Symmetry: C3
Subunit: 109 residues, 3 copies
Amino acid sequence: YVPGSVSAAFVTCPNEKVAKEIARAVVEKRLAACVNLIPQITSIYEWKGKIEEDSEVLMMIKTQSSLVPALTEFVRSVHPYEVAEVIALPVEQGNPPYLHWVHQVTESV
Amino acid sequence: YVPGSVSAAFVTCPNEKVAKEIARAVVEKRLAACVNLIPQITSIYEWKGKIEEDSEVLMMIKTQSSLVPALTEFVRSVHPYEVAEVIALPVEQGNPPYLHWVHQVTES
Amino acid sequence: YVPGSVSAAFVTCPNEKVAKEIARAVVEKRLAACVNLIPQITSIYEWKGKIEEDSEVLMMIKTQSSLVPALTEFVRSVHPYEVAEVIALPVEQGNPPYLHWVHQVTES
């Protein structure tokens, strides 16, 4: 395992149906090895000077770090918002056969 | 995008109502760009030798890394418990215009 | 605070009753200081040429970075999976007495 060669990316979505469309497509396209959907989130941020509280879904995405720029761009291309929240945090350690799988199921088309 | 220059911080609150109040507060004060609250969490740890399980709310907060010290101090004050659990993890990549927006709505 | 001396590990489990026995066991063995269980996740991934969506529980475990291999070995020895997902992310900043507490309850 090379530290930092896998990453967990977060993306938030307006509802569960868009989240699952997008989760299903990143995996079909091999941009990611798996996606965990966390429903029922409440997002709180400022917009147009006012504080909003939206009902959302958070996606946690496991992919190779070298693929996050293509993941992200795919995300921008389909996402309802027009500035989509994508962040990716490096995996330093883990289950060595899990990490390998992430690499396998996501490499070389 | 400068790697490491935005962090995602995670904070555990005893219930929705305090979590929402803190989340509102840190965003109004521009200590954070946005906060995701995740309800119906269960936390398990040792207390004075013995396993507990609490019912809580986990907050994920995005903000500039150089702001992590003040957010944490804000969270410490404001308080229910004595030791506030805040950890921040470095964001290495992501959607540039989004990360740019984080830096601007918390800017200096 | 030594940056990256604490880690946040994510483990995905089939249900609440499994995540909970593992959660209790890692805390008890002092492989971890604190575990949060996030219920009601959907996992999406390709298996056998098609998309699977399973109903699952995500655990988030705070512990000493130096303890992750022993954490991971234990998780793998008790976990129904057959390739359990365990990933760890370095905690670069946060609440120093909290982080000191993570180290004390898992002390070497």
